[PDB]
Amino acid sequence: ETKCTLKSFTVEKGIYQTSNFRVQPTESIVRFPNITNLCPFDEVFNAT
């Protein structure tokens, strides 16, 4: 990777920065309020 970054097949003595490390997320979470305000859809559809 150091070779690939320097764009050369030979590397001299030293310290070289090559890439970045970052922990990838594990899973996704979605949060919303207590959505319970339902309309009278059923009360209208089942009306006599």
Partner: protein
Amino acid sequence: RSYGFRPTYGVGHQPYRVVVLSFELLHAPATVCGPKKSTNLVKNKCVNFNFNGLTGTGVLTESNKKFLPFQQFGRDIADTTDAVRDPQTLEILDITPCSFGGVSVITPGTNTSNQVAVLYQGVNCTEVSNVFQTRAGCLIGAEYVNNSYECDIPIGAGICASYQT
């Protein structure tokens, strides 16, 4: 005309109830929306969190800040989001960015040998053969010798590396 529901008549004269739904979209201060919450929660590890929008990535932990009743999320200087109120249980959670940092390769040069040691800058390797922690980060692949020598390759915080031979 009278339906007259006897078993004599056919299928084309049966009492089918029907309903049709129509929708309006112009001039939308949206007040209706179908999709429910469909929520999920987990903490103590990096997750793609969505709190009434506010899409971001990070780890959620227990916070100690005292939000006001009407505040939903907070920010630090430079407008970085630090905390979010869980819309379900109203708990204030602290958001911390996931652990990341640049990695540098300590090399004595292909002229000498192919050995290499990697330095994770600023990372505490408690969360990612010899593993050694220094003020500049964590150094993997190099052993800490207690004999002091001249600095060959500077790592940082008064520590350097070199090929022993």
